[PDB]
Amino acid sequence: NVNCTKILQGDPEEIQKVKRPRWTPHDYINMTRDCASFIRTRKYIVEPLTKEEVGFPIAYSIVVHHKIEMLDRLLRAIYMPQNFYCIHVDRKAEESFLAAVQGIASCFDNVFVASQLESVVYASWTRVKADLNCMKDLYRMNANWKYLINLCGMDFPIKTNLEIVRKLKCSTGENNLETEKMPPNKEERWKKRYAVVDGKLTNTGIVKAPPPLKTPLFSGSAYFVVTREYVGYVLENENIQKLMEWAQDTYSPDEFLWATIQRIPEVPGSFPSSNKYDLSDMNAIARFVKWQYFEGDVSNGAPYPPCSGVHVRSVCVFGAGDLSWMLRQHHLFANKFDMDVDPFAIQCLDEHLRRKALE
Amino acid sequence: NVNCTKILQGDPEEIQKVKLEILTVRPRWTPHDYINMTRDCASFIRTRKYIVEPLTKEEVGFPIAYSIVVHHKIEMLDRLLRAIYMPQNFYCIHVDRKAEESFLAAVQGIASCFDNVFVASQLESVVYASWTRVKADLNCMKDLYRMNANWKYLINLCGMDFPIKTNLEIVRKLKCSTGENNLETEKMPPNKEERWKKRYAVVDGKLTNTGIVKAPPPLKTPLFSGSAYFVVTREYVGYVLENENIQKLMEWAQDTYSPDEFLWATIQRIPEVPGSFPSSNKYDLSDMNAIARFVKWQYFEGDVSNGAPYPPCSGVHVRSVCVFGAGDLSWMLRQHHLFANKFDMDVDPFAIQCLDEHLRRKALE
Numbered sequence: 251n252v253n254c255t256k257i258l259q260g261d262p263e264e265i266q267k268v269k270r271p272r273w274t275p276h277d278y279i280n281m282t283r284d285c286a287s288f289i290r291t292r293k294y295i296v297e298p299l300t301k302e303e304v305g306f307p308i309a310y311s312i313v314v315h316h317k318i319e320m321l322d323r324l325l326r327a328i329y330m331p332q333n334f335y336c337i338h339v340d341r342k343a344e345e346s347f348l349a350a351v352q353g354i355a356s357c358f359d360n361v362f363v364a365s366q367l368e369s370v371v372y373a374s375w376t377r378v379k380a381d382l383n384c385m386k387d388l389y390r391m392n393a394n395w396k397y398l399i400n401l402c403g404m405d406f407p408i409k410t411n412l413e414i415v416r417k418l419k420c421s422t423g424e425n426n427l428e429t430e431k432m433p434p435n436k437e438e439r440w441k442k443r444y445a446v447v448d449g450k451l452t453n454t455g456i457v458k459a460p461p462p463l464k465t466p467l468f469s470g471s472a473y474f475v476v477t478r479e480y481v482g483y484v485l486e487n488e489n490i491q492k493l494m495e496w497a498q499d500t501y502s503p504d505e506f507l508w509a510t511i512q513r514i515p516e517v518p519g520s521f522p523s524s525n526k527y528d529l530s531d532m533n534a535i536a537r538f539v540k541w542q543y544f545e546g547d548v549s550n551g552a553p554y555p556p557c558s559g560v561h562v563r564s565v566c567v568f569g570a571g572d573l574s575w576m577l578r579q580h581h582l583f584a585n586k587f588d589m590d591v592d593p594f595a596i597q598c599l600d601e602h603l604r605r606k607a608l609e
Numbered sequence: 610n611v612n613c614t615k616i617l618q619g620d621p622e623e624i625q626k627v628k629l630e631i632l633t634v635r636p637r638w639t640p641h642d643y644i645n646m647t648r649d650c651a652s653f654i655r656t657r658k659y660i661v662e663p664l665t666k667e668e669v670g671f672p673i674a675y676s677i678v679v680h681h682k683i684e685m686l687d688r689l690l691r692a693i694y695m696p697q698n699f700y701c702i703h704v705d706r707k708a709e710e711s712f713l714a715a716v717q718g719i720a721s722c723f724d725n726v727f728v729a730s731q732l733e734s735v736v737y738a739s740w741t742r743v744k745a746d747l748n749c750m751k752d753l754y755r756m757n758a759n760w761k762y763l764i765n766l767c768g769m770d771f772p773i774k775t776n777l778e779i780v781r782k783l784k785c786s787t788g789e790n791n792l793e794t795e796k797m798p799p800n801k802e803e804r805w806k807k808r809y810a811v812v813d814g815k816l817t818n819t820g821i822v823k824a825p826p827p828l829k830t831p832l833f834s835g836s837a838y839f840v841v842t843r844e845y846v847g848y849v850l851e852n853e854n855i856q857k858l859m860e861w862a863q864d865t866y867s868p869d870e871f872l873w874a875t876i877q878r879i880p881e882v883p884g885s886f887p888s889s890n891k892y893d894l895s896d897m898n899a900i901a902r903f904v905k906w907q908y909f910e911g912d913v914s915n916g917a918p919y920p921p922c923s924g925v926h927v928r929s930v931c932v933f934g935a936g937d938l939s940w941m942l943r944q945h946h947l948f949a950n951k952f953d954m955d956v957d958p959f960a961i962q963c964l965d966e967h968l969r970r971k972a973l974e
């Protein structure tokens with residue numbers, strides 16, 4: 251009964267009216283037995299919408315571990331025939347979850363499950379390796395995709411696939427990720443060797459050697475928008491390898507490795523290491539994210555308005571109230587959303603992108 | 610007499626050749642020559658080869674507006690004007706009143722050959738680093754604003770600027786700006802606060818610090834540091850011309866030093882201003898992140914593979930600002946900026962020469 255168009259306009263009425271039977275992996279394993287029906291019923295798009303999009307193939311590395319129904323909506327939201335989608339399922343997900351992903355992945359020849367799966371531990375190298383596994387497959391399996399966008403189960407796009415290609419063009423062969431001067435408060439992350447003690451990455455207290463790099467370490471996000479040339483480079487380059495193994499025992503390497511690579515002289519699509527080229531999460535186009543401690547009055551020093559949903563680890567899990575402002579940002583994808591916190595943020599967004607993409 | 614292609618590819622031997630080409634010595638037009646040449650428009654246009662026919666349907670549907678500020682060197686003005694001329698666009702030229710009558714006449718001369726090119730209805734006597742430099746652009750904005758309502762963005766240029774993107778490339782980046790303004794705007798550095806803390810007066814033709822402390826800015830939002838160059842939407846221009854508060858802000862800045870390097874940067878961070886950015890520093894644009902103007906400063910140049918924003922200047926340095934030599938061209942063309950600064954015919958015509966044909970050759974596709 252909810253009127254989406256109104257939520258998309260900030261209308262306080264709907265926002266308030268907004269602010270149960272749920273599918274399960276088994277329900278998916280069953281819906282996918284017949285691909286043609288799943289696709290038709292779930293209204294997936296299997297026919298390029300424009301030649302412009304067919305001429306600009308994108309690759310995606312989606313790291314997941316549960317919430318099968320979110321993965322379904324996410325994929326459909328960003329699905330196109332010319333693209334390439336490598337799904338990474340955590341080696342620890344529910345066997346039925348895994349089988350459910352395979353069922354969805356096996357209905358499209360451009361969708362598949364990474365040939366190597368890692369058991370992902372929070373803030374550890376494995377998180378990066380998850381994405382690396384996906385890069386290895388996508389890089390070798392095709393040489394025509396322009397950029398690689400890595401996602402996660404709780405991301406959702408706020409742009410159609412057309413708008414994404416156009417912005418990727420505006421990038422003119424350059425990458426686009428958050429990459430800034432190392433905050434002193436995040437240095438402890440890589441100045442000490444870490445290890446998994448009790449399923450938790452802990453500080454061993456051993457001081458690490460300096461990074462085998464002439465370039466300084468930069469700070470960023472785990473999400474990115476890099477060119478195929480970048481991927482091949484971190485995959486092949488003899489030095490990127492020295493750095494990567496050095497980062498293996500650091501805390502949250504995913505939030506400093508990509509951003510540091512982006513500023514290494516020889517890297518395709520990179521930026522000079524002069525802080526004149528630094529990119530903050532708001533300047534970059536990778537992902538729009540609201541951190542608890544920055545929300546406030548945008549008319550007084552705040553990057554963005556306060557969160558209408560809830561917060562998990564200081565990260566705003568969007569609610570129907572956030573949509574209006576969010577949609578006016580330049581980012582490709584927003585994080586995070588949760589069917590268990592507000593399925594309406596996702597529904598309204600979902601339909602909007604589909605309609606806007608069909609007009 | 611020299612292979613441009615090589616120069617754009619950064620060939621050391623070739624760059625070295627222009628050096629020998631210069632010292633080892635020509636046609637030099639003057640304001641009068643132009644007053645004569647403009648007598649017959651058909652000929653001037655045809656001869657100087659001005660693209661008087663819209664190139665694509667994509668450009669015709671996306672009108673651009675330019676505000677060019679000049680005071681001398683009429684041959685430079687004509688070259689820059691041809692490099693960016695397009696029938697669908699609009700060009701407002703501001704000639705300094707301290708300029709030679711022959712020069713102003715030359716510009717009035719050229720301007721008459723084009724219905725879309727005109728001299729600003731109000732000319733200022735510009736003083737370096739003074740509020741009058743901001744007033745000149747403001748004078749153009751009003752003329753361009755009232756003259757037409759279909760141009761999307763206004764780009765302000767000075768005499769020594771040259772484009773490094775074709776008009777279509779420019780139109781495309783503007784479409785990508787998706788309605789936002791693009792210009793430098795960063796946290797106000799400490800060493801530049803003195804520019805607006807004290808009052809400034811022109812003494813013997815040079816703006817000097819009176820010592821008289823001034824009232825705080827008429828703003829709830831902070832003061833931002835930037836440059837005199839920008840890219841803004843027809844709405845940004847409209848708002849600054851009609852908005853009350855801004856008036857109080859501008860007049861308050863009339864007695865400041867280089868009001869042009871904090872004024873625009875600041876208005877771009879004001880809530881309600883069309884195409885602005887949150888005051889939060891997460892949205893700060895450095896000169897390299899913005900796309901308005903590529904410019905190298907002597908104290909920043911050096912080993913790019915070691916922290917330097919860009920490599921050493923190949924031309925010369927006027928006031929710490931690099932005047933481009935053929936040698937700078939290669940690296941510069943790979944930057945995302947719309948225009949560069951600065952170029953000097955007397956320092957290296959080859960840099961302007963190659964850059965000139967390359968852009969034309971590329972527009973023609």
Ligand SMILES: CC(=O)N[C@@H]1[C@@H](O[C@@H]2O[C@H](CO)[C@H](O)[C@H](O)[C@H]2O)[C@@H](O)[C@@H](CO)O[C@H]1O
Pocket residue numbers: 428435436470471472505531539541
């Ligand atoms: C204060 C602090 O260290 N917070 C950490 C988070 O930092 C944010 O990182 C994002 C990157 O997209 C962005 O730079 C933001 O401005 C930062 O505040 C973040 O690193 C988090 C782990 O995901 O850990 C917090 O401790």
Ligand SMILES: CC(=O)N[C@@H]1[C@@H](O[C@@H]2O[C@H](CO)[C@H](O)[C@H](O)[C@H]2O)[C@@H](O)[C@@H](CO)O[C@H]1O
Pocket residue numbers: 793800835836867870896906
């Ligand atoms: C060191 C210093 O104060 N230099 C002044 C110039 O500063 C530069 O300003 C540009 C603006 O585009 C850019 O931000 C660069 O990083 C700065 O170094 C500049 O303000 C100039 C006046 O035009 O005066 C110099 O003294």
